[PDB]
């Protein structure tokens, strides 16, 4: 599938960002030629809530920078 290549690129890009302890969940869909995606990342339980927010914002920048067709990306965090 065209989509599985894209999903591989999101996961790979997310996992390279400092503080990411793996991708817990990824759901991606096409809206025309654009991708909209929902991503959940793992983070250190001892990080602050503010740190987990910064890591999500860094994941969003890194993913959207690498995958140009992404036009909406939501990133949240869970302790792992």
| Residues that constitute the known binding site | 38, 53, 74, 78
Instruction: Decide if residue 1 touches a copy of itself (CB under 8 A).
Output: no
- 3-class state of residue 61 by DSSP: helix
Pick one of 30, 45, 61, 72: the residue that binds a copy of itself (CB under 8 A). Answer: 45
Pick one of 1, 4, 32, 48: the residue that binds a copy of itself (CB under 8 A). Answer: 48
Instruction: Decide if residue 40 touches a copy of itself (CB under 8 A).
Output: no
**Integer Cα distance of 58 and 4 in angstroms:** 23
Closest CA to 10 of 62, 78, 54: 62
């Amino acid at each position: 599938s065209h989509m599985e290549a894209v999903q591989n690129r999101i996961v790979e890009a997310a996992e390279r960002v400092p503080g990411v302890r793996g991708v817990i969940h990824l759901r991606a869909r096409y809206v025309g030629q654009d991708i909209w995606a929902d991503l959940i990342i793992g983070v250190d339980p001892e990080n602050t809530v503010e740190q987990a927010h910064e890591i999500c914002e860094a994941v969003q920048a890194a993913v959207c920078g690498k995958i140009r067709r992404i036009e909406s990306l939501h990133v949240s965090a869970e302790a792992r």
